[PDB]
């Protein structure tokens, strides 16, 4: 193998390099918002983001070693979690704002244009707040993101799973390594490591809730989602 064969800071670099770009929306800023324009804008964006993240998943150590069918499964489970923590990450330094895109910066009050969406914004804002309290770093974030990809689908899949757990461990080592040389005490390393991974629990929740909101919006036929969106969505039920 070769995922097992990286150094701690060879892991970080590979992940930093693998990062997908940041996309703009097609948002005409001279036009105010309605529910249908909102969803449209936000779904159009997520759809274009989906292509990059897939080509990003192929560049995360170990993933390509997994069978095609196991790769599909991990993606179907985590896509919105991954979209979400990315969103949360971009917004970190925009208190009270959600940066869906550099040209699409949403105030929590704007979330109300879409029915039911306001709760989801509040959670996403809080997570972003949390990242700020904790002063989350880029190197850890990319580690967290990879964890989500490898961890969310795994317990619903044959020791293909064992390999996934080895890379999970390698990503833990990596995170500890970062905090160690960030000058953290041994105890301060455990606590932070736990604080970070505990957040993923809330991110799972946001994604579950969000998923249902999307299904809701499609049933309502308020906006037509792309055909990738509607597949990623139907994977969940």
């Amino acid at each position: 193998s070769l995922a097992l064969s990286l150094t701690a800071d060879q892991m970080v670099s590979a992940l930093l390099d693998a990062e997908p770009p940041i996309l703009y929306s097609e948002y005409d800023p001279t036009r105010p918002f309605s529910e249908a324009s909102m969803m449209g804008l936000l779904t159009n964006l997520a759809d274009r983001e989906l292509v990059h993240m897939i080509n990003w998943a192929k560049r995360v150590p170990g993933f390509v070693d997994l069978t095609l069918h196991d790769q599909v499964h991990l993606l179907e489970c985590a896509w919105l979690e991954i979209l979400m923590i990315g969103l949360v990450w971009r917004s970190m330094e925009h208190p009270g704002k959600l940066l869906f895109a550099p040209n699409l910066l949403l105030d929590r009050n704007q979330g109300k244009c879409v029915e039911g969406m306001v709760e989801i914004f509040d959670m996403l804002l809080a997570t972003s707040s949390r990242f700020r309290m904790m002063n989350l770093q880029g190197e850890e974030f990319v580690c967290l993101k990879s964890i989500i990809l490898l961890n969310s689908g795994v317990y619903t899949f044959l020791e293909e799973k064992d390999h996934i757990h080895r890379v999970l461990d390698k990503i833990t080592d990596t995170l500890i390594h970062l905090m160690a040389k960030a000058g953290l005490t041994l105890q301060q390393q455990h606590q932070r490591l736990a604080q970070l991974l505990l957040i993923l629990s809330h991110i799972r929740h946001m994604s579950n809730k969000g998923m249902e909101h999307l299904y809701s919006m499609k049933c309502k036929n308020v906006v037509p989602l792309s055909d990738l969106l509607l597949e990623m969505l139907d994977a969940h039920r």
Binding site: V51, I54, L68, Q71, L75, L228, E231, M232
Partner: peptide
């Protein structure tokens, strides 16, 4: 399914 195509590509 579009995911499978994109992935294997």
């Amino acid at each position: 399914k579009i995911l499978h195509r994109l992935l294997q590509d």
